[PDB]
Coordinates of C-alpha atoms and ligand atoms in Angstrom, one line a residue:
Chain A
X201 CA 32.7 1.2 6.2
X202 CA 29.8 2.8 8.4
X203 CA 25.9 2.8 8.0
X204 CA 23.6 5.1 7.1
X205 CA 22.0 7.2 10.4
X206 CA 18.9 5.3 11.2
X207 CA 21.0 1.8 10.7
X208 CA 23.3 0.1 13.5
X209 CA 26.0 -1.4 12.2
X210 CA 27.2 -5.0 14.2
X211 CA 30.4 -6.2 12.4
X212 CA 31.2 -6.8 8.8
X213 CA 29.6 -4.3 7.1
X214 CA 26.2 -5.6 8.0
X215 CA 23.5 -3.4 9.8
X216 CA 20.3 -3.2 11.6
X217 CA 17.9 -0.5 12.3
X218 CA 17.9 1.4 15.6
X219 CA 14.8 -0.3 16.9
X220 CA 16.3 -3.7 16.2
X221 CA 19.2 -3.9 18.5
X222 CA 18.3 -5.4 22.4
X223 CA 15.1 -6.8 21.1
X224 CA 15.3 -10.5 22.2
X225 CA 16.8 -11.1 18.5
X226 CA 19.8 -11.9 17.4
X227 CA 19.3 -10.6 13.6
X228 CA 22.9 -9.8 13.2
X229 CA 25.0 -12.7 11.7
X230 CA 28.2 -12.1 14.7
X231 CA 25.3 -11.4 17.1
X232 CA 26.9 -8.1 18.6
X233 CA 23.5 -6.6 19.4
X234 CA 22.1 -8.8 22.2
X235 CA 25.9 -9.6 23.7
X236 CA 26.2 -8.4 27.4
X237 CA 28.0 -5.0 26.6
X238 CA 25.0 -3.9 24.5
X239 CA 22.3 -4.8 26.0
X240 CA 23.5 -5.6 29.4
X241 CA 22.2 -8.9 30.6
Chain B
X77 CA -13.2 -10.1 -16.1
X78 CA -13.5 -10.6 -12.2
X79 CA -11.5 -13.5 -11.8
X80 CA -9.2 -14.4 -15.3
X81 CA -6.2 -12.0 -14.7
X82 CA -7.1 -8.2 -14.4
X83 CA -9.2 -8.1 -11.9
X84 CA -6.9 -6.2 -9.6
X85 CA -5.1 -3.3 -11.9
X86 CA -2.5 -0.5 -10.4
X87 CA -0.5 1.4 -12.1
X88 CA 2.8 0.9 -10.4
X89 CA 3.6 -1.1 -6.9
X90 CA 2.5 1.7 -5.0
X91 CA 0.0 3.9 -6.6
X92 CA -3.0 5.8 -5.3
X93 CA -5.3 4.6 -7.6
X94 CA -6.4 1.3 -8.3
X95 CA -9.2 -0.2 -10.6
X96 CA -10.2 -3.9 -9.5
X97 CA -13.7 -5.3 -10.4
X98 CA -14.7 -8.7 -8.2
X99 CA -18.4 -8.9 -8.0
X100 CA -19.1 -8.2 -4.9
X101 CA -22.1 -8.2 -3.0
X102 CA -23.2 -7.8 0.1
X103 CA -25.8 -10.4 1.5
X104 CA -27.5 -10.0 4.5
X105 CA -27.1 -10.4 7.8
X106 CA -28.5 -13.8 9.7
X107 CA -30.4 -14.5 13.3
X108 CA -29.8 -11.7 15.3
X109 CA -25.6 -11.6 14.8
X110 CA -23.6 -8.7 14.0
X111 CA -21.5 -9.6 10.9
X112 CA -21.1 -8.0 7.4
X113 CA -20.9 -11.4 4.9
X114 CA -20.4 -10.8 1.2
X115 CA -19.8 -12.9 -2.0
X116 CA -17.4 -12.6 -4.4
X117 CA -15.5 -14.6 -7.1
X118 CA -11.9 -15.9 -6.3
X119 CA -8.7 -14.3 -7.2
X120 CA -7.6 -14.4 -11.0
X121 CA -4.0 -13.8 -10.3
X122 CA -4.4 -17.1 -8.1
X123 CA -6.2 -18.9 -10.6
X124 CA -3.4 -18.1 -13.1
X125 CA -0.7 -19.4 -11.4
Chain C
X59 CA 14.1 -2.7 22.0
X60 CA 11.4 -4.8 22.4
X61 CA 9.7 -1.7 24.1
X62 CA 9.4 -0.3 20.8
X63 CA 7.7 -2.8 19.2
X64 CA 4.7 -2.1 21.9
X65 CA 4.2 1.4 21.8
X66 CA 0.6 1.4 19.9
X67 CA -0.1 -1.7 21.0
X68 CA -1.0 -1.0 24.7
X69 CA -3.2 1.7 23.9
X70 CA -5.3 -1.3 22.6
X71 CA -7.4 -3.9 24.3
X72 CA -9.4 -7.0 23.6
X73 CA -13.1 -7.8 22.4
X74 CA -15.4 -10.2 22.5
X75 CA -16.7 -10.5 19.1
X76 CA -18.7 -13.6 17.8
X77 CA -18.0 -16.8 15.4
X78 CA -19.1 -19.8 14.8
X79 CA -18.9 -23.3 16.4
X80 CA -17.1 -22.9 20.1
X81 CA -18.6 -25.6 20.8
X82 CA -22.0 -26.6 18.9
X83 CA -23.8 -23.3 18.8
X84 CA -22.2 -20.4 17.4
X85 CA -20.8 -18.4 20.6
X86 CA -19.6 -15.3 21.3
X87 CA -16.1 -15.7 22.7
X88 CA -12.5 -13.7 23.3
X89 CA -11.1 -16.0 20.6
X90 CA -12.4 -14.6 17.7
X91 CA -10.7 -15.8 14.5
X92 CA -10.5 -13.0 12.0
X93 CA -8.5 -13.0 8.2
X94 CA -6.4 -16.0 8.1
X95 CA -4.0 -15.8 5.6
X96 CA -1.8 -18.8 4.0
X97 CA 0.1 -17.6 1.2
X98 CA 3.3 -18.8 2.4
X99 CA 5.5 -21.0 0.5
X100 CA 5.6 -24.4 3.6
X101 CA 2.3 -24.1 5.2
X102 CA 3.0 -21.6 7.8
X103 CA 0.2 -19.3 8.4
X104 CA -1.0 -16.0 10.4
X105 CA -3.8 -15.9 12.4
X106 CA -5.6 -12.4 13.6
X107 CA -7.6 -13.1 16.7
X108 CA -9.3 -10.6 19.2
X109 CA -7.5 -11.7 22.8
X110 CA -4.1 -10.1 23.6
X111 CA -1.0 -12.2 23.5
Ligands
LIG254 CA1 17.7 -7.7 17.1

């Protein structure tokens, strides 16, 4: 399924908020947020 | 009783209002510094645990 | 972003504020430590300072 609106989601069904994501932290348990596509480094 | 287990009452985990009794007092300032010291008895919610 | 974490926190600056025993005679210095807390469950602890990290 999706997240709510102020929640990003990174893979099976697990989510961050919006400020979260690109933040030198890899909260998210497939570490999606900080990958190069994302965030670009 | 300032430092058994109620000394630090609210009604729910986030209300407005709050009674807490400590006794508190504010001593006084020393040698020329700027500080605000005060003395008051240790927690009761850490004393009964 | 880690741009958002640091929003408020440039419109803030340091202070020199005083405490006791720099060396042997109660300074006043940048490092100012203010409310340690240790409530933690392995020793780890947070320390408020005045300087800017
Ligand atoms: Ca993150």
């Amino acid at each position: 399924p999706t997240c709510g609106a102020h929640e990003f989601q990174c893979s099976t069904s697990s989510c961050i908020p919006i400020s979260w994501v690109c933040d030198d932290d890899a909260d998210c348990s497939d570490q999606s947020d900080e990958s190069l596509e994302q965030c670009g480094r | 009783k300032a430092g058994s287990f109620g000394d630090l009452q609210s009604r729910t985990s986030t209300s407005n209002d709050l009674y807490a009794n400590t006794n508190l007092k504010l001593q006084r300032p020393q040698a020329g510094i700027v500080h605000t010291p005060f003395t008051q008895v240790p927690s009761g919610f850490e004393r009964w645990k | 972003d880690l741009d958002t974490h640091f929003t408020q926190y440039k419109l803030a600056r340091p202070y020199i504020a005083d405490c006791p025993n720099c060396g042997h005679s109660r300074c006043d210095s940048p490092i100012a430590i203010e409310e340690v807390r240790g409530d933690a469950h392995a020793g780890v602890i947070r320390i408020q300072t005045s300087a800017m990290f």
